[PDB]
Structure formats: structure tokens, C-alpha cells
Amino acid sequence: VMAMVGHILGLGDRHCENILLDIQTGKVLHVDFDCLFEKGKRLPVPEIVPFRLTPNLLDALGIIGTEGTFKKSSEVTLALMRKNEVALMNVIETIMYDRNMDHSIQKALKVLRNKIRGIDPQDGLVLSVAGQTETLIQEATSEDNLSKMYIGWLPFW
Amino acid sequence: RQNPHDKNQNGQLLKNLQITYEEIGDIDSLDGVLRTFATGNLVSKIEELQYSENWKLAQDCFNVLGKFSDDPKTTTRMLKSMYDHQLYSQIISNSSFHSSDGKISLSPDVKEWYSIGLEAANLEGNVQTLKNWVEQIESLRNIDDREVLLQYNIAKALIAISNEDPLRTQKYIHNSFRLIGTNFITSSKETTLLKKQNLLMKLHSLYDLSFLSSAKDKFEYKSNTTILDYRMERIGADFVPNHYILSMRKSFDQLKMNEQADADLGKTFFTLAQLARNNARLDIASESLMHCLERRLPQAELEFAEILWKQGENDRALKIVQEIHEKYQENSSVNARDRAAVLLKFTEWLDLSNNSASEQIIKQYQDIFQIDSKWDKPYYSIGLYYSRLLERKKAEGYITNGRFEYRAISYFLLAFEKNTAKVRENLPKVITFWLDIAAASISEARKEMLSKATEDICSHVEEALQHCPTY
Amino acid sequence: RQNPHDKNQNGQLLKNLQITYEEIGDIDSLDGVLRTFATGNLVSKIEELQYSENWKLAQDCFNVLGKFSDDPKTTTRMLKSMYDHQLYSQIISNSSFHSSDGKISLSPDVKEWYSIGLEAANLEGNVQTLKNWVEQIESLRNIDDREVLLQYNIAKALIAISNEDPLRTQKYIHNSFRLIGTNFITSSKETTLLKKQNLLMKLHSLYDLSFLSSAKDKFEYKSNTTILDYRMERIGADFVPNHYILSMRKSFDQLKMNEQADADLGKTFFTLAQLARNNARLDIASESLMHCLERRLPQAELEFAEILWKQGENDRALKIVQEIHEKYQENSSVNARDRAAVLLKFTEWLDLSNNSASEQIIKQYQDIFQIDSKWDKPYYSIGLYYSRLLERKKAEGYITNGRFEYRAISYFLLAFEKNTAKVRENLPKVITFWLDIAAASISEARKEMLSKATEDICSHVEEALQHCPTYIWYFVLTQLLSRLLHSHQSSAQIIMHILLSLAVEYPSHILWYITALVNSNSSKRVLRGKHILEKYRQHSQNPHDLVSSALDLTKALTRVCLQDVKFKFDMNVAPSAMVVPVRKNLDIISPLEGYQPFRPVVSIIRFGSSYKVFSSLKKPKQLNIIGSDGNIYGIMCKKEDVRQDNQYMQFATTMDFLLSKDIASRKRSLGINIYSVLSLREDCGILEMVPNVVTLRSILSTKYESLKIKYSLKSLHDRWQHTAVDGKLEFYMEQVDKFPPILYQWFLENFPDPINWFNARNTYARSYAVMAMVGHILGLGDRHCENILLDIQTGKVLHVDFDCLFEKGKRLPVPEIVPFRLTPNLLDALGIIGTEGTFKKSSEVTLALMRKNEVALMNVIETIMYDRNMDHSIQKALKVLRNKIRGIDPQDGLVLSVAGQTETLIQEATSEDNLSKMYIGWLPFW
Ligand SMILES: Nc1ncnc2c1ncn2[C@@H]1O[C@H](COP(=O)(O)OP(=O)(O)NP(=O)(O)O)[C@@H](O)[C@H]1O
């Protein structure tokens, strides 16, 4: 849930000190959030990211790799987030406010809102649940993207 | 981990792994297993859409599979998969037991056909089919399955109260209590009670059947149904036990042909249509909602119109709420709640149809203003309407300072005072372009489109703030 | 018309009007009637989704309605509505007749329960249920209904051949012949045979049952099934008779438990699953397709996978075709057809899943290259794959010259040679970025990414051209006419080479083209016309010199540009070999071989000497011409650079063949009225003149003055133009309330016979609706009232002008923001239901067709863009147009795109404020 909501926010730069894991019950969270809206791509050491996923998570998730309750959580998460995203749009209006950022603009926030709605990379036919789930999964499992980023984000960790 | 990956010994430790995930109850762990290299037969590979949101193609595939009624496996999974997404009228009308005689005497190893059918016959019941079919299934010499005897005794309690004998009804209800207490119950440490739901669901329904089987008069009856509404409060919103308990209630008060039983019947038809709309499988919403449509419930008409509006059918949704509301200006039929609600839903269908814009809904919108002032989710829904309208007006150019957003802020801060549902999502809906017109005040001195409007809407925020809750 | 509108006497003349529309058979006229103020009961209002594409909710509503089995009306409509979308297994398994005994003895007034059930029991049959149930229904004392005796006797023939007695089978088949010949048959003059289909469908099935009931052995049997495949050729693609006939075949060869009957069974299960996939109701495709899945048909597995891929289920579609193909590398199972097809479908599912891109499909793609070379719709499908890929690569930046598009062109011109399916849509797929890399060659000298690649791919085009069929090149010939500029010179040499091919072979169809070729005033066309004339007369076939006669016709038609007055000149060129510029020169037949890809030659014989010029301030000298058969066809001159009208004509003349390919449009006999137009010189071109040229402006001026509607004739523009936006709607309402709804008073005078009137009203609504929304899809605008064209033969409508496109009313002065052209005075003449009818259904089917293959339509409208006509309509503006064609709303999602977009166009045209907010030169009520 936190993993795809981060890339929905356009988070990036998920260095491996940012996974947080309790040994009580294994609940995961990203905590950092100190960089957003394309701070790996148009920033040096170009870090075009699907989102953070470690291939060594996949055996530990089970025999079925990542193809499971991961995927169902992704389905229900997207089905919830595309029910009331205009309230989420009202929340992320507060984000924009770029004392942090250079030229992330209001129209860039509308482009973000288009991404939140389901506007594909210049494409239609938006299934937005199984299709977008398969989009995130089979873009994170793309090993060329796993190789084409900096090994400060060493992906197998 | 430690094996040859492509190997012969994998398949048995796939199939017992998926039957222990049937034990584990995580249906999506089952789904990942059936989709991760469990690809033997095509009739083994079509059990995944079964739980991947497309059960209809799976179900009519299984009912054309098992239609020859000889194979054990395909026919058992036919009835079970047909059960598992609530085609219960089709279960009971299925002539795998109905024939020129009754069902199969000396119930074979596929007695789970019966054990999955009697429960559907319970939760959608009549007199004659329950009667002749459980009196067919009594003709067994032995009854070795626990579940067939369970559902048998709850059915014989139902025919006992068809014959109107509540002490014998409680006799069989307590027999069913004995069956579950002696034969069904597993322990703690092993079960997140999802797996217990098949037991506690049926027992909740059974006790709810029981004490108002042991009812006397209508005062007791309405009291029993009021605390059944408390049961429907404490159930949460889990669809299958929701459906099961109130459909069992429905079966009982259509068994009982009493007239307040018929009023309770109609309203419970209405409410299971409501939860079926809420969980978006609105064929069962239609097939339930009919029995209160034909008994003259115009709110049930309106929410038949909303399932039609939901699915694909903007047109007659508009048209039937058009004829119903613009016919309903007779005696009160409460104007502030019922007529306000149906005209509200009419107005936002004109929103999401987007053909007969503002002024046509402005007139009936001020009609809503007249007929209701105590109920504000009208005001939140027209607030999101004006959200859409201000976005459309700004979508062509940066032209601001319309009276529509001013009135939007005005009723919206009025709506803040009343129910507090969308407030904690939509305080930006006032303050964002409130501070944008403050930025227009610092921006441009044409642009004396702000000043007096700014003072008036700030006075609106003031009268919101002296009356508002703090939190 | 003449009544109180809100009145008590309306309702009976609503309900008998809808039962006579049950007689009329126009189901969508029925739909418009049930949706236009027929709103009595809710159980009366839920018979509209019945035919509005959502029959499932209607059907289970009716089966919970009629489930108590006592009411006549609800239960009869339960079984009938349950029948009318083919839930026939549920009809036969329905226990309204099945019980602890059989059905109801002494079959009551609701015997139509039986009469709708026996036919379903026929077309899905067994032994025992047919047997015991028709032997229940024999126990009637009398059998008064005709249809129950019909279906009874065909069922008793079926049980007779279950008992295997073919002479008694033919006895009952001939009895059924006697029943229809004596009791069913109505006449001519009254029926477009849609209404006869319920008879001729059953009799076709009955005879097909009959003569192979009268079969002897397997040789006779396979012969009978082969000519049944001929019957399945001549049936067309109408779903309900398709389904009925081959399901009856299915019922018979599952009756017959013979083993070749079982092979025929399995393949007919497969084929009705195929047509059920084709008509997109794939629950019946599953419930049929099962019986050949369990009998080990892997092609049936693959197309089970394709119904799952179609609906919502990308995942196991990928997975089961994965396991099936990557298991199937055993004994042959033919590699070039079956394995090639399943791996092809695998590859384009990896396309439309878009997760495991090129290299993974590149390997099995070259496997496809290895295992098949004789079957090229692989190559067309990977051509559209690379269309998607080049668009994706260009979508980030203008980086060109990849090997992928080079190979795409290479196999694609190889694919041209073989089957010719997508060629006539997708010749732009080679030539567009072929001429774009020619433009890169003239653009930039880094950019030596073109040169050797340009030579190699031009050699590919050369080896395409020496082997190619000649006739396929003409389908882009105007853009081939739109090729003039240098800096390649070998594309110029090869386009003159294809001019030589298309001139030597088929010289007749290119006469006007090779003469309009060199006709300009900035004539750089001298080289490209005179040199191709030299080379064609160098080629050996020049018996006759009609070239100079065609130049004389051209110089006459440009001499008559100014012969003003406010004709009997030179002739005798006719008769010649000059084939007529009517579309009965250039229409292309569907491929049904040997065959000929054109019409027969319609030359010229006579020349009209009388002038019939109008007074339209430029005065086109339009002629009346006698053809080769002898018939008169009006042939017009035209001025002011008529090239874009030929462009829109070419878009329309691919659109109409797409309408023919649609088995839902021309199922309802859709299509457009159309003419011919060519450009000859600048400000000089040719036109066809339609039979009954008339317009709403002229003939409604005559009709309003036949009612003597006297009005402010040419001062309404003054008293509206001086009027501001406040009184614009006021004066508009003043006008349109002075002017009455009339046009039915003109239609009834056009057509005495209401046969002609009502079929012309259907033709009117459809032929107006299709052209009407396709115009605003093109962004047409400025539809002045001289542009409606209406034949008095059959009421077919067409817009003809097309001289202005892409926002020429809004960003042009007198701002004319338009929904599209619709006259409110059309709405009464369309019927009682206003515009809410077969108009709307034509709109639905038109949009459903146009958003199936719009990328080919995008290839066509690429030729449009080319703004010598327009100022800044740009390539990105063409992409915005393509977004509009896809369904991109005004900055909105949730695109239903058929009922929603139909309602969008309808309820934007009916917006009276838009009707007032435009210039009364476009006076809307006319
Ligand atoms: N809010 C938090 N809750 C829990 N753990 C946290 C939190 N913030 C940081 N941590 C943990 O603290 C660890 C030590 O790093 P920390 O000092 O917090 O930031 P950091 O190492 O300085 N990142 P950087 O600034 O790039 O060097 C991280 O690996 C996190 O796991």
C-alpha cells in the first residue's frame, strides 16, 4: 500500500535505510518522504524508477513470488483511491507549495491528478485495477530498470 | 527451496498446499497458488476467475460442466461454486434434485450436493419446496454428514413454524445448537474467525430466528426487529454474513404471512437490495428489490433507479426519477427527507449526465433549499457540484469571482454545522480559493470583483466560526 | 399533431402504436416509442433495457416477475423475453412445465409458453426431454395454435430420427412444410423480410435437417456438411439465424451418436462459439465451447483464451496460451497455420498487455518468421504493433531512423503481395514516414541516419512494386497525386513507375487523373505530366489518342469558368473511350474470387449541349450528360480549389466500406449517400450532381411560403445583428415560434406511398445522422442551409460541401460555436418520438464502428492535415483531433462512448441556447 502510494506521489530516491519493519508483526512503512515529484530523473544520476521493490522480497513473500495478496492489496488499494481522489486532490493541493521544489507547477499538479485518475502514458483503455496493478508489478519486475539505477539504491537489498 | 525446480515431486506438494490454503482461508493466497504454475487442465485453470471478480463465466462454465449429473467432482464443484456467490434461487430451482420424483434416495458420496443445497433452501424459503424436499431427504436410512443434519433441523424448525408451533420450533433450534456444540466447534490459537464465520453466521441467524419464533404479539415483534436492527448495527459491513442473516429474516417473515411480517418483509427486501447495491452485485439487488417494488415503495423505486444509474443506464434513471419526483408533489411524503432526497439524487444525476446544466437544477435546487434545511449532505453534494463547475470555468481561463462559488462557500460552511461528513476532507473547498481571492486582493486593484464579495464571504466565515464545533 | 398534447385519448393511440410497431418490426422505433412518454408502470418501463443492450437485468427481472406462474401477461413476457436473447438451455430447464408430472394438460390461453418453449427444445435437443415433453403435449384434445403444431411436428421428426426412420422423418418434415405453406405465409408489398426471417430461418433449418436426414453414408454426410458450409457462406452474418441454423445442426448431430456426427458436433460447437465471440455475448460461447474443449480441441482452447482476453481477463489468457504454445512443440500440429496462429495471438496479447516488450516477442516473432511465410495477417498485426512502437518512441521526442520501422516497412510490403486486407487502409503506414525520412533527407545533412537506410528501404519498395498487384495502389492515389517536391528523386521515379504500372494496366481508370496531373498555373507539373505521357506512349499500348481529347475537355471546362450572363458549344468528342467520372467507374468490389476489382466500363456516348447554370454568384456551368448505357447523369464544374472535398470524399469512401464490413450497420442497412469529386486544375474541378438536388433552404422557403409564413425576409439579420446577446435568444424564440414545425407536410407530399415514405424516413434519419456526427467529428462547421441534400426518390441525406474544417466558425469572425447542424423542424418529421429513435441507434452503431479501427481512420485523416488551406492547424492539433476521435471528453474521463456520447451529441444539439447563439445565416429552424 505504502509502496504504490509513494510512486503515486512521485516519491523517488528510496534508499535502503527507509524500509521500516517491526519485529512484532512485520508491518512495513516508508518513513522518509524528503523528496518528491521527479527528484531522481531530472536530478543528476538519472534514477528513472518503477518504484522501490527488492527482488529478494519475492521469495520471502511466499512460493508465488509477488503474485498474491500483494496483488489483491494493490487491487483494493487502487479501488479505494479512485473513489474519492478529489478529496485526495484537496489534500495534495497543500503539497504543491514549492518552496522545496523549483518548477513543479500547478499544471504539473493537474498532470499528477491525471496520473491519480488513471491517465496512462498517453494511452486510453484504462482498466485501472487489474491492469494498473499488473502495470506496477510488471514494471517493478523489469530487470533492466533494476539495473539502470544507481547502486546506492542497490535493488537486491 | 531445496529441490529440482522443474520436477515430478512438485505437483502433489502444490495440490495439498492449495488444500491447506483452503484450510488457511486466505482466498487470495489460494488465488496466487492457482495462478503460480498450477496449470494442469483447463478445467483446473478456470477456478481462478472464480475469485478474480468474474464468477459468472466461472459459474455457467461449471453448470455446463456438471449438467450431465454423473461425475462426482465436476458436479460438486458446480453446486459449490454456484453457492459461493449467492445464486441461491438458481440452486433451489436447479433440477439436480427436482424431477418427476424428489431427490436421490440413499444420498451418495456426493451428499454435499444436498449439504450445499439445504442452506440455500433455508435462506430463500417457501412452504412447499422446503416441505416436500426435506421430507424427501428424511427418507435416508442414515444421515452421516453433520451439515445435512444441521440444515435439516433448521428446515424442520421452519416448517414447524409454518405449521405455527413455536415450542417445537425451539425444540429443533436447540437440536441445531446441540449439533454445532457437539460436532462443529474448533478451538482458539488456530483461527482468525473468518473460518468461524460459517458457524457463527448460521448461529446468529438461528438465534435471531429463535427468540422471535418465541414472540407473542406485534409489540414484541417490532421490539424484536428493533434489536435485530441493533444486530445489523453490530454485524459491521461484511457482505456474506449481512446477506445471510437478513435474508434468513426475509425467509422467515415471508414464511409468516402476517401483515406486519409483510411490512417487515418489504423493508428487509429493501435493505438487502441496499447492501447489494453497496457491494455492487446488482442483479440480486434487482431480484430482491422487486418484491418491494410491486408492494409500492417509491424509495425502492428510487434506488432501483440508482442501481440502473450505477450500471450503464443514465437515460431511464433520469426518466423514472423525473416522472416519480415531478409526479410526487401530493400529500407530504415527507418533503424534507423523502422528496428532498429524491430531488437531490435527481439533481446530481443531472450533474453526472451533464446535459441540462445549472439553471434547470438551480430552480429545483432552490426547491431543495425550501423543502429542507435540516439535512446537509444535499449541501455537500452541491458543493462538489460547484467544485466541478468552478473547475470547468477555470478550465478555459483564469476568470474568477463568480457568485456561484460565493454561495457555495456560504451553504458549505452552513453544512459544516450539521453532520460533519465531508468537512474533514473538504475544508480546502472553502479555504483554497478563499486565499486565492485574498491573493487576488494583493494581486490586482477589472478586478474590483473581489472587495465587497470578500467582506461578505468573510462575514460568512465569521458566522460559521462563532457557531462551529472547535474540533 | 391535432389534439390536446396532455390528454386522456393519447394512451390508447400509444399502445396500439407500439403494437403496430411490433408489426412494423423496427425494434428501435419500438424503443423510441417506449422511451418517449410511455411511462405508466415500472413493469411497463423495464421493457426498454430489454433492447437497450442490457437484457440480463431485464430477463432476471421478468423471471422473478413471472415466477409464481399464475399471471398470464407477466409469465408470457417472461418466457418471450427469456427467449429473445437465447437463454434456451434455461428455457428448457425451466420448471414451468417440468414438475412431478409433465406440463399442464389442456394447454390454456397461455399456450404461447409452449409455443415459445418447443422451439428452444428443438434447437438444443436430447432424446429424453424432447421425447417425454412432446409426448406430454400430444395429450391435448385440440391443438388450435399453428406454431405449437409446427414445432411439434419438427420435434416428432427429431424423435423419429432418434428412432432412426428417415422416411417417417421426411413425412413429418413435409407436414411442417404443409403447415407453413397453408398457415404462415404473408405476401409481398408489406414486408422487408426481417419479418419473414422467423419463417425462412426455420424452413432453411428444416430443409438442412431434411436432406441429410435422407443421407446414406459418410461420403454423402461430409458432402451434405460441405454444402451446409455453403449455406453458412450464403447466410451472411445475421446472428440470430446464424445461431439458429447451426445450433439446429448441432442438435441433430448430437441426436445422431455417430462418430463423424460427433466430429461434426465438435466443430459446430466450435463455430457457434466463434460467431458468439464475433457478436460478443460470450457466455453462450463458453457454454457451447465447452463441449469441444472437453473433446480436446486446442484451437477451441485458444479461442476460449480469446474470449477471456476480450472480456476482462488478460492474466490467465496470457497464462493458458503460454502453457499451450510453449507446450506445443511436438509433432507438426500444423506449424505454419495452427502454431503460427497461436504464437501470433500470444505475441499480440503481449502487445495489448504491454509488460514483456519487444525482445521477448522478437524471439518468438522470428520464430513466427521461421514457421510461416505464406500467411501475412501476422505481418499486418505486427505492423500495427510497430505502429504503436514508433508512436511510443516519437511520443518522447523526434528521434527517428530505427531499424524497427525499416523492417516494418519491409515485411509490410511483403505482406501487401499476399492477401490484401489492411493494405487499402494502411498504405500510409509505409508512405507517411517514408516521405518523412525523405523530408529528413532534405532537412538535415547526427543525421546521416537516413541515407543508406533510405536506399535499402527504397529498394524494398522497388521489389514490392515489381511484384505488386496494380489495383491496390489507387487507394492512396490523391496523396500519390500529392507528391511533387524533390530531394529524393527516386521516390519520384518510383511513383512515376507506379503511374506507368497503373497507366499501362487499367488505362481507363486513370484518364482524368493523368490529365489533371499536368493542369496548373504555377505549373511545375509540366515535367511530371509530359514525361509520363512520353513514357506511356513509349509503352506499346497506345491505339487511340484520347489524351488530347481529355485536354480539350479540360480547356473547355476552364474556359467556362467565366462565360457569365445575368450552351451549345463544341462537342462530338463523345462517343469515345472516356469512362465516366461517376462512382460507377471507381467503386471497388469486395474480394470474392476469380473476380475483377472494378465495375464494368461505363464510357461516354453523348454530350449535353444545354446549360443549366444556377445564379450562385459564381455560376457553375453544370452539365447534363448521357452516359454509355444511355442514362442521364449530371456532371458539374466546380471552382476555388476543390481538393479537400475529394479528401473528405476519400474518407467517406473508405467509411462506407467500413460500414459494409460492419455486420451491425448494414445489418440495419446503414450507409451514406455519396457522389464523386475530382480536382482538375486550380479553381477547376469536377462534381457529380445527385438525383433530386434540393436543400432545406430552397424548398423550405417554398414550403413556408406555401403556408404563406410571411416574415422579416432579409431584415431579420439586421434586427438580430444589432441585437446583443440578451435579446438573441428572445428574437430566436420569436422566430421559431412564428415558424411552425412543418417538414412532415413536405415529406408526405414527397412520398404518396407510405412504403416509400416510411422507408425514406428510416433512410432519412440514418443517412442524416451518420454524416451529421461524422462532420463534427471532423470539426466541420459553417453548415449553411444550402448544404443539406435530399433525394425525393428515397430520402437519403448527405452533406456535400466540406469546404471548411477544423474550427472555422469559432476562431473565425462571427463566432459560431456549434454542437453540429441539426434543425428542430426535423424532429417532428422524424416521428412522434422527436429525435429519440433510430437516429439514436444509428448514432450508437456508427460510434461503435468508428471506434474499432480509427487508427486506419487516423491514417486517412493524416492526409487532411496539410494546411495549405489552414493557418495553424498543427500536427499536435491532429493528435488532439485523434483524442476526440478516441473519446477524450472535454478534459473528462468516464467515457461510455456509445450511449453517453450519443446522448452528448443529441443533448448538445437540442440546447436551444446554442441554437440561438449562432448566426441566422445558419437559421437553425430551417
Ligand atoms: N521517523 C522515524 N521512525 C522510525 N525510524 C526512523 C525514523 N526516521 C529515521 N528512522 C530510522 O533511522 C535510521 C538512521 O537514519 P537517520 O539518522 O534516521 O536518517 P539518515 O541516516 O541520516 N538518512 P540521511 O540524512 O540520508 O543520512 C534509518 O535507517 C531509519 O530506519
Ligand SMILES: Nc1ncnc2c1ncn2[C@@H]1O[C@H](COP(=O)(O)OP(=O)(O)NP(=O)(O)O)[C@@H](O)[C@H]1O
Ligand atoms: N456535388 C454536389 N452534388 C449535389 N448537389 C450539389 C453539389 N454541389 C452543390 N450542390 C447543390 O447546388 C446548390 C446551389 O449551390 P452551388 O452553386 O452548388 O454552391 P453555392 O450556392 O455557390 N455555395 P456558395 O459558394 O457559398 O454560394 C446547393 O444548394 C447544393 O444543394
